[PDB]
Design a protein around this motif. Structure first.
Motif, PDB file in Angstrom:
ATOM      1  N   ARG A   1       0.820  -1.208   0.000  1.00  0.00           N
ATOM      2  CA  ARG A   1       0.000   0.000   0.000  1.00  0.00           C
ATOM      3  C   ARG A   1       0.853   1.258   0.000  1.00  0.00           C
ATOM      4  O   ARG A   1       0.507   2.264  -0.635  1.00  0.00           O
ATOM      5  N   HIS A   2       1.950   1.238   0.737  1.00  0.00           N
ATOM      6  CA  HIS A   2       2.806   2.400   0.814  1.00  0.00           C
ATOM      7  C   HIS A   2       3.463   2.786  -0.530  1.00  0.00           C
ATOM      8  O   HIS A   2       4.159   3.802  -0.586  1.00  0.00           O
ATOM      9  N   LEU A   3       3.261   2.008  -1.608  1.00  0.00           N
ATOM     10  CA  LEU A   3       3.921   2.255  -2.891  1.00  0.00           C
ATOM     11  C   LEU A   3       2.955   2.585  -4.012  1.00  0.00           C
ATOM     12  O   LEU A   3       3.378   2.760  -5.165  1.00  0.00           O
ATOM     13  N   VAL A   4       1.668   2.635  -3.715  1.00  0.00           N
ATOM     14  CA  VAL A   4       0.635   2.685  -4.732  1.00  0.00           C
ATOM     15  C   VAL A   4      -0.211   3.905  -4.461  1.00  0.00           C
ATOM     16  O   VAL A   4      -0.649   4.127  -3.331  1.00  0.00           O
ATOM     17  N   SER A   5      -0.384   4.711  -5.490  1.00  0.00           N
ATOM     18  CA  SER A   5      -1.018   6.019  -5.439  1.00  0.00           C
ATOM     19  C   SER A   5      -1.880   6.146  -6.699  1.00  0.00           C
ATOM     20  O   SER A   5      -1.660   5.443  -7.677  1.00  0.00           O
ATOM     21  N   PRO A   6      -2.865   7.028  -6.662  1.00  0.00           N
ATOM     22  CA  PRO A   6      -3.735   7.162  -7.853  1.00  0.00           C
ATOM     23  C   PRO A   6      -2.961   7.550  -9.114  1.00  0.00           C
ATOM     24  O   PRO A   6      -3.278   7.100 -10.228  1.00  0.00           O
ATOM     25  N   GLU A   7      -1.945   8.396  -8.958  1.00  0.00           N
ATOM     26  CA  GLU A   7      -1.122   8.794 -10.089  1.00  0.00           C
ATOM     27  C   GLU A   7      -0.257   7.647 -10.575  1.00  0.00           C
ATOM     28  O   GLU A   7       0.106   7.625 -11.750  1.00  0.00           O
ATOM     29  N   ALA A   8       0.056   6.677  -9.692  1.00  0.00           N
ATOM     30  CA  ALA A   8       0.851   5.511 -10.072  1.00  0.00           C
ATOM     31  C   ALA A   8       0.040   4.548 -10.917  1.00  0.00           C
ATOM     32  O   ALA A   8       0.561   3.939 -11.855  1.00  0.00           O
ATOM     33  N   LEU A   9      -1.227   4.354 -10.575  1.00  0.00           N
ATOM     34  CA  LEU A   9      -2.102   3.499 -11.372  1.00  0.00           C
ATOM     35  C   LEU A   9      -2.592   4.163 -12.638  1.00  0.00           C
ATOM     36  O   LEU A   9      -3.005   3.464 -13.578  1.00  0.00           O
ATOM     37  N   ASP A  10      -2.620   5.486 -12.680  1.00  0.00           N
ATOM     38  CA  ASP A  10      -2.965   6.105 -13.945  1.00  0.00           C
ATOM     39  C   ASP A  10      -1.836   5.860 -14.942  1.00  0.00           C
ATOM     40  O   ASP A  10      -2.065   5.289 -16.014  1.00  0.00           O
ATOM     41  N   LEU A  11      -0.587   6.174 -14.554  1.00  0.00           N
ATOM     42  CA  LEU A  11       0.559   5.819 -15.391  1.00  0.00           C
ATOM     43  C   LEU A  11       0.491   4.364 -15.822  1.00  0.00           C
ATOM     44  O   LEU A  11       0.703   4.040 -17.001  1.00  0.00           O
ATOM     45  N   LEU A  12       0.178   3.464 -14.883  1.00  0.00           N
ATOM     46  CA  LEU A  12       0.236   2.052 -15.219  1.00  0.00           C
ATOM     47  C   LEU A  12      -0.795   1.705 -16.266  1.00  0.00           C
ATOM     48  O   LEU A  12      -0.477   1.037 -17.251  1.00  0.00           O
ATOM     49  N   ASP A  13      -2.039   2.139 -16.070  1.00  0.00           N
ATOM     50  CA  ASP A  13      -3.088   1.851 -17.043  1.00  0.00           C
ATOM     51  C   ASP A  13      -2.699   2.352 -18.433  1.00  0.00           C
ATOM     52  O   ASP A  13      -3.033   1.718 -19.439  1.00  0.00           O
ATOM     53  N   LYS A  14      -1.961   3.446 -18.516  1.00  0.00           N
ATOM     54  CA  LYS A  14      -1.601   3.968 -19.823  1.00  0.00           C
ATOM     55  C   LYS A  14      -0.313   3.369 -20.385  1.00  0.00           C
ATOM     56  O   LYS A  14       0.014   3.625 -21.561  1.00  0.00           O
ATOM     57  N   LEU A  15       0.395   2.547 -19.607  1.00  0.00           N
ATOM     58  CA  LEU A  15       1.516   1.792 -20.165  1.00  0.00           C
ATOM     59  C   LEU A  15       1.103   0.395 -20.625  1.00  0.00           C
ATOM     60  O   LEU A  15       1.469  -0.054 -21.715  1.00  0.00           O
ATOM     61  N   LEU A  16       0.337  -0.321 -19.816  1.00  0.00           N
ATOM     62  CA  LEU A  16      -0.045  -1.680 -20.167  1.00  0.00           C
ATOM     63  C   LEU A  16      -1.399  -1.644 -20.889  1.00  0.00           C
ATOM     64  O   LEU A  16      -2.458  -1.767 -20.284  1.00  0.00           O
ATOM     65  N   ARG A  17      -1.349  -1.459 -22.205  1.00  0.00           N
ATOM     66  CA  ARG A  17      -2.503  -1.499 -23.127  1.00  0.00           C
ATOM     67  C   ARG A  17      -2.213  -2.559 -24.167  1.00  0.00           C
ATOM     68  O   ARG A  17      -1.056  -2.784 -24.495  1.00  0.00           O
ATOM     69  N   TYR A  18      -3.236  -3.247 -24.656  1.00  0.00           N
ATOM     70  CA  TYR A  18      -3.004  -4.141 -25.778  1.00  0.00           C
ATOM     71  C   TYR A  18      -2.483  -3.344 -26.979  1.00  0.00           C
ATOM     72  O   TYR A  18      -1.388  -3.613 -27.483  1.00  0.00           O
ATOM     73  N   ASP A  19      -3.239  -2.310 -27.392  1.00  0.00           N
ATOM     74  CA  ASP A  19      -2.868  -1.451 -28.513  1.00  0.00           C
ATOM     75  C   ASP A  19      -1.530  -0.749 -28.328  1.00  0.00           C
ATOM     76  O   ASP A  19      -1.422   0.298 -27.696  1.00  0.00           O
ATOM     77  N   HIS A  20      -0.504  -1.334 -28.894  1.00  0.00           N
ATOM     78  CA  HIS A  20       0.829  -0.764 -28.755  1.00  0.00           C
ATOM     79  C   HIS A  20       0.870   0.699 -29.201  1.00  0.00           C
ATOM     80  O   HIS A  20       1.633   1.499 -28.652  1.00  0.00           O
ATOM     81  N   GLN A  21      -0.001   1.087 -30.130  1.00  0.00           N
ATOM     82  CA  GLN A  21      -0.059   2.475 -30.566  1.00  0.00           C
ATOM     83  C   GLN A  21      -0.619   3.395 -29.500  1.00  0.00           C
ATOM     84  O   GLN A  21      -0.269   4.568 -29.448  1.00  0.00           O
ATOM     85  N   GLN A  22      -1.527   2.923 -28.687  1.00  0.00           N
ATOM     86  CA  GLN A  22      -2.053   3.814 -27.675  1.00  0.00           C
ATOM     87  C   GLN A  22      -1.135   3.944 -26.472  1.00  0.00           C
ATOM     88  O   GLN A  22      -1.435   4.733 -25.569  1.00  0.00           O
ATOM     89  N   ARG A  23      -0.042   3.195 -26.429  1.00  0.00           N
ATOM     90  CA  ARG A  23       0.828   3.213 -25.255  1.00  0.00           C
ATOM     91  C   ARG A  23       1.484   4.578 -25.109  1.00  0.00           C
ATOM     92  O   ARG A  23       1.951   5.174 -26.079  1.00  0.00           O
ATOM     93  N   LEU A  24       1.493   5.090 -23.884  1.00  0.00           N
ATOM     94  CA  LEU A  24       2.326   6.263 -23.596  1.00  0.00           C
ATOM     95  C   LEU A  24       3.746   6.083 -24.137  1.00  0.00           C
ATOM     96  O   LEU A  24       4.409   5.063 -23.864  1.00  0.00           O
ATOM     97  N   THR A  25       4.235   7.083 -24.893  1.00  0.00           N
ATOM     98  CA  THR A  25       5.659   7.088 -25.238  1.00  0.00           C
ATOM     99  C   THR A  25       6.515   7.379 -24.025  1.00  0.00           C
ATOM    100  O   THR A  25       6.015   7.774 -22.983  1.00  0.00           O
ATOM    101  N   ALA A  26       7.862   7.245 -24.201  1.00  0.00           N
ATOM    102  CA  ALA A  26       8.776   7.599 -23.114  1.00  0.00           C
ATOM    103  C   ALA A  26       8.623   9.056 -22.681  1.00  0.00           C
ATOM    104  O   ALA A  26       8.589   9.341 -21.479  1.00  0.00           O
ATOM    105  N   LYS A  27       8.510   9.988 -23.624  1.00  0.00           N
ATOM    106  CA  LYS A  27       8.410  11.389 -23.226  1.00  0.00           C
ATOM    107  C   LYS A  27       7.053  11.695 -22.578  1.00  0.00           C
ATOM    108  O   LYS A  27       7.001  12.454 -21.608  1.00  0.00           O
ATOM    109  N   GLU A  28       5.941  11.150 -23.119  1.00  0.00           N
ATOM    110  CA  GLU A  28       4.633  11.350 -22.487  1.00  0.00           C
ATOM    111  C   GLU A  28       4.672  10.841 -21.042  1.00  0.00           C
ATOM    112  O   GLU A  28       4.270  11.541 -20.108  1.00  0.00           O
TER     113      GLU A  28
END
Ligand SMILES: N#C/C(=C\c1c[nH]c2ccccc12)c1n[nH]c(N)c1C#N
Length: 325
Positions: free
Chosen positions: A284-311
């Motif tokens: 719990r001490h490592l998980v924050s709403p901003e951490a799961l937002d980043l995560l949801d936008k990295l692990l997508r099936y659609d490789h095109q929708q994935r956040l780039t490194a700069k995003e």
């Protein structure tokens, strides 16, 4: 089908830049370097510690297996292109054994602490700091036209006391060109994007971003690896139990991807899980709403929708690391 960033960057450079078959390494003498200790053997590789006797600079020595000249040139050329890039392992020399004539690459040494003992102790800030630093590495090589294709904890060397990070092992890295079809036999099973597991060859830098998601999830949920597959089939099944199976068929449809009939009997129907389903008192001490937002936008099936490194580097998850620069 096409990368969303830097798609054309190699075509706007001299052919010399990305035409590795035509690169000529100068092969030095692998006897100036004295082996000390075999930090682990591998596929076409075995890796050792040693000293540049010419002054005494510690080093690491990767002894290729020269039944593939082309793979050798690819890696040498890529490290030449990334010399002095943010957080990339510095390649020092290329050498061969006189009496044996087998080639080898010599790398700046790193007092890394093993991820299996260092992930145990990372704070929520550590995780954000090192991830940012891994992101800088990935945005560099991508913008230099290059996919790493093997992002994973063993290849992210971290000196915690110096607070230094080095991404390493470029023997699978490859120049990105649009529409080019690539081999899927890249990356460790646990960090393979679904594009590789469904045999879609037209992939791009966004694959490293999936790999990075996987690392991120394992770090904030303390489940390492996060998607612990038994083979390439079971790995895609593990992913689908989390991302949902309907959101997988939609991807395959979008990209016209032929699905091996052996997946029907094993995929089942699963709904998309809530990334909060993984939180418990030990992490719990490592998980924050901003951490799961980043995560949801990295692990997508659609490789095109994935956040780039700069995003990704812009994400609020990293605002704590920005200010402390
Ligand atoms: N992973 C990796 C790399 C080396 C190692 C491979 N097995 C190991 C086992 C224990 C300690 C180091 C390594 C590597 N590539 N370039 C470097 N300086 C490296 C280092 N260390």
């Amino acid at each position: 089908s096409r990368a969303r960033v830097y798609a054309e960057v190699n075509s706007l450079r001299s052919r010399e830049y990305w035409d590795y078959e035509a690169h000529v390494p100068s092969w030095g003498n692998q006897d100036d370097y004295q082996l000390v200790r075999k930090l682990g053997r591998g596929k076409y590789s075995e890796v050792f510690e040693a000293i540049n006797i010419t002054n005494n600079e510690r080093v690491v020595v990767k002894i290729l297996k020269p039944v593939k000249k082309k793979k050798i040139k690819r890696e040498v050329k890529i490290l030449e292109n990334l010399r002095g890039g943010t957080n990339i392992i510095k390649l020092i020399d290329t050498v061969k054994d006189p009496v044996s004539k087998t080639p080898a690459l010599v790398f700046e040494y790193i007092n890394n602490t093993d991820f299996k003992q260092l992930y145990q102790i990372l704070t929520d800030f550590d995780i954000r700091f090192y991830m940012y630093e891994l992101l800088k590495a990935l945005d560099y090589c991508h913008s230099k036209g290059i996919m790493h294709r093997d992002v994973k904890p063993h290849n992210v060397m971290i000196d915690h006391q110096q607070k230094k990070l080095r991404l390493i092992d470029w023997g699978l890295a490859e120049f990105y060109h649009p529409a080019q079809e690539y081999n899927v036999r890249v990356a460790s099973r646990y960090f393979k994007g679904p594009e590789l597991l469904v045999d879609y060859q037209m992939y791009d830098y966004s694959l490293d971003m999936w790999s990075l998601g996987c690392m991120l999830a394992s770090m904030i949920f303390r489940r390492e690896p996060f998607f612990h597959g038994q083979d390439n089939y079971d790995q895609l099944v593990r992913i689908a139990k989390v991302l949902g199976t309907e959101e997988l068929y939609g991807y395959l449809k979008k990209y016209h991807i032929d699905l091996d009939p052996h997946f029907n009997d094993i995929l089942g129907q699963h709904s998309r899980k809530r990334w909060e389903n993984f939180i418990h008192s030990e992490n719990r001490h490592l998980v924050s709403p901003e951490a799961l937002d980043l995560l949801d936008k990295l692990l997508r099936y659609d490789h095109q929708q994935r956040l780039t490194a700069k995003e990704a580097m812009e994400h609020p998850y990293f605002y704590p690391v920005v200010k402390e620069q």
